[PDB]
User: Fold this.
Amino acid sequence: SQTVHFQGNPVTVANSIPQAGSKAQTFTLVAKDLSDVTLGQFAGKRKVLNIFPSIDTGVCAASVRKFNQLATEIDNTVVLCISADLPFAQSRFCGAEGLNNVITLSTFRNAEFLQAYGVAIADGPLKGLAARAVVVIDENDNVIFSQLVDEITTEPDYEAALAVLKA
Amino acid sequence: SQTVHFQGNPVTVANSIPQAGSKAQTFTLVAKDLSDVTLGQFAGKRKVLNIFPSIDTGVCAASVRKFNQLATEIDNTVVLCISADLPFAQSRFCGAEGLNNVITLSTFRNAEFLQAYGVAIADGPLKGLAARAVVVIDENDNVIFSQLVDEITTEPDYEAALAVLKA
Assistant:
């Protein structure tokens, strides 16, 4: 298990986020029309897993869409914005609005994803939600960047994620 | 299991909804402020579990709030509006705001509730959501009325539920 912070308060997160070098575990998640989406449907693309406690917070942080946009301007890249929000709530997400190759996916019937990817919050009020995390997977499903964000309300190292994506 | 319908197509619902005469099982669900709420916190009251596939569909039918208000106009009655939507989304529901004794509750980290109450959609695109159902529990924690609604988009027999609460 890992420790992150919320309102600078400590939060346990299950297991261990995948490390660069490792093979990405397969998953199934749910798209905005309630269809099932698997990692294998993105075979040969680079994938960013952009993992949030919620994407239904009612505030549209500029940094979210900025990263999503920069990431998908790199050829052969998809960004998967993942959270425990139901598809009904993700359908109006502002960070995917107006951007191709940015897809929202929900964990509501696939809780094993959050365990497998080391991002399941295990205690406190946010128990059951995902931690803030970014995971970059290459064309052959190898992890090439991961970060479990130390303060859930602050930005990931987008600059570092984008550098891996290009390089 | 049980079979209901969604826009006329058959939908499997796990286990069996509790029937009149059944003992109400304890449960824990999550409130709008991410706190845990249990059945035992309503000891001494009659409780109506008003169970929805989602309360964030973008459409608020007038029949929903009407029932909630009529029910809570009966002395010693609370209405628990229950769904898989996260607490973040349950703020867009039209049927609880401004009505005392009408409370929204989420199943998002208590999936066992939907199993125990025979309301877990087991197949199809709605898998993981609750079926539409009404369960009325009395002061002895006995179930005195229940209905697993045949067509998930259509109203329960609110008249029958209200009658059981009066008598």
Q: What stands out?
A: Chain A touches chain B through 20 residues (CB under 8 Å). The helical segments of chain A are 62-73, 87-90, 112-116, 158-166. The two ends of chain A are 30 Å apart (CA to CA).
